[PDB]
Design a protein around this ligand. Structure first.
Ligand SMILES: [Ca+2]
Ligand SMILES: [Ca+2]
Ligand SMILES: [Ca+2]
Ligand SMILES: [Ca+2]
Ligand SMILES: [Ca+2]
Ligand SMILES: [Ca+2]
Ligand SMILES: [Ca+2]
Ligand SMILES: [Ca+2]
Ligand SMILES: [Ca+2]
Lengths: 152, 151, 148
């Protein structure tokens, strides 16, 4: 037995040391271009791309375009948008069924923070969503270039 | 002694984490970070006024660069030369003129003032700036200097 | 007792958090190929300054030793739309490109007619956006990509 027990005290100690260095490196990681809320991390690319290119960039990297599902997440996304001062695309579109915004998974929105008047399908052709510096959403034509923020 | 089987599998995965985390540190710190002892300095890459620079670092969990030793100052200095822009440090004397404190309130443990500094030029220099040669100069808090935080 | 299986839980939690961390770290500026990570600085510098930057950071300038590595490096160079410097030079022996360890090349992906040492001036190697290599003067400014 008790060799076993020494090994546990040893392993536990090297594990606690690794979670200490991991917390510090997580903060350094997110500065300046990232934000975490719960288990989700938003990180911006720092550049501007049309919806399809933005979505491709995020899935290829193993994530998804920012999809705020609660008020706290929208706040965290807003910090990133305020810091960069460019509005960002969110993941959701209504291109399947005009007027029903769906997460890229197909499910209906659980949270929304639409600017008054929106969504308004302006010009007959506004299928993507953009979050502005004030945290409110506006629907926008997918072909516009907006800030790429992915979530992981 | 079933446990021994699971403990050896664990040792192997801890060992895997330890080595992957070691590679990641270097990747992470490239090109905007520098570590000295237990501390990491990371530059935001952009220039901002003191009160803003300070907010950005506190919102991110950190603190503005506060070198407490020559080894710490030389590591901050390497980031400043690479970026080629002077950077604010955390210390000010906006509460008591002449007494520079860390944001916590204690007096300076190390200083590397340029000859003649701090000189409170114009009656209005309450923040400290580190130059590309590693010497500190007291500067007006409303200038825009490189944001470097410490973690 | 199962103070082991408490530890088990903490290891698996780190493995999940560390896996999420890697994705965030590599977005948008890095690529992993096997054990190797390529990461760009984002800016452009001449060979010696690029070579210093990488070694200072604990790593090396990109040395793609396989078609697979050169492809990950190329995915980075297309995203920045800027050709990158590779580690290899022939500055010791004109026409034998060496990796900085001193050995001869394993893998090459030269463009047709390269290396041609245009002007007598060309001792460093750039990778273009199409993945093809060209020998270029070391004093040109190119994207800094290091490998870890
Ligand atoms: Ca439509
Ligand atoms: Ca619509
Ligand atoms: Ca609209
Ligand atoms: Ca004063
Ligand atoms: Ca003063
Ligand atoms: Ca002064
Ligand atoms: Ca030559
Ligand atoms: Ca040559
Ligand atoms: Ca050539």
């Amino acid at each position: 037995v008790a060799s076993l027990r020494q090994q546990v005290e040893a392993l536990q100690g090297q594990v606690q040391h690794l979670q200490a260095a991991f917390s510090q490196y997580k903060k350094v990681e997110l500065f300046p271009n990232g934000q975490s809320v719960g288990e989700k991390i938003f990180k911006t690319a720092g550049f501007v791309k049309p919806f399809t290119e933005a979505q491709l960039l995020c899935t290829q990297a193993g994530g998804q375009l920012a999809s705020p599902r609660s008020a706290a997440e929208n706040a965290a996304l807003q910090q990133l948008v305020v810091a960069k001062n460019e509005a960002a695309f969110l993941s959701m579109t209504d291109s399947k069924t005009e007027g029903k915004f769906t997460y890229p998974t197909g499910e209906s929105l659980v949270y929304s923070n639409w600017a008054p008047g929106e969504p308004n399908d302006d010009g007959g052709s506004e299928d993507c969503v953009e979050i502005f510096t004030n945290g409110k959403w506006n629907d926008r034509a997918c072909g516009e270039k907006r800030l790429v923020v992915c979530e992981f």
